[PDB]
Design a protein around this ligand. Sequence first.
Ligand code: NA
Ligand code: NA
Length: 326
Amino acid sequence: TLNGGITDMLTELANFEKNVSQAIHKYNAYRKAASVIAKYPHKIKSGAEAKKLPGVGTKIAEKIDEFLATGKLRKLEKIRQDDTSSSINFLTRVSGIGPSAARKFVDEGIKTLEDLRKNEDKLNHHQRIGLKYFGDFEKRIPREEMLQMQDIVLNEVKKVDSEYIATVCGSFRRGAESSGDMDVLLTHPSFTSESTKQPKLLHQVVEQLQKVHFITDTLSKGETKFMGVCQLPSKNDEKEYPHRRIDIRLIPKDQYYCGVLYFTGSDIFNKNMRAHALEKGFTINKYTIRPLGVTGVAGEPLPVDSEKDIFDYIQWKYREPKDRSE
DNA sequence: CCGACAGCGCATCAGC
DNA sequence: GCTGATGCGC
DNA sequence: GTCGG
Ligand code: NA
Ligand code: NA
């Protein structure tokens, strides 16, 4: 309400940079501007005011001046009207159709879901699945269903092998009221850094979840990452739930908690902890925390047996996932 | 004035 | 057949 | 597009 007109503007501009211009850094640029503006607790009155925010520069300030004085942005209006650009932008909403496939399709007259349905032979497997669940995938997942999806995932994982450790991360683990998908982090004691993976630890879990008909489709699957589709069993009385996106990553046990830390987020929080970790003389990524020598050389990964272990290393009090908004 | 902006697993394409 | 590049999603 | 070396 404060600046929703501005952030919608910037978001639309962002999508067009990503899907049509293929300028991924401009996409993140506009997105970064939209975020910071979303958090500014004042109704912006001028481009110059906005420019004071980190991530808002000259150009976006000019655009805000124009939107403020007129209620629209000329570039955006033109783009909206544009047949090619809007079709290209629309097709990328299909999972598996990126900017390049979307451009190709539109070049050959394929520009609607209907056109996609009429040329299914020109779609790979991932795209067909995305096409199939176009509507369901754009739906959000209420926490209540996320909790009914977790039960299922934790139950069947333990059913396969009770030494398995599984953690539903993402914004769900931070307490969020809804989710966009489900991100599962999987480990097993038999799988470590310098070790075997019994190259079937992941497959086994994916198989069992297919068995009880939770996982309904597969977008991709290897020895360490599964990307797929799942669906809560329908009540017997009422509407069947929409199909959801689920990812499952098998991680080495000695890297599990760094992984859980990282995929729990949030992104802002990961930025801070890693920045703090550096100032404290540690380097933190997805996999490990390592000490930094005097000449800047990273030593071997330190032992980690919980999220808290990491916090202790960099001398900060353990923060609850609920409190990692930033 | 100009390069960074995250980077990696998996599917599939390009090319040998 | 293979390796390496690209597209994609996260 | 924005930031910063
Ligand atoms: Na700024
Ligand atoms: Na897409």
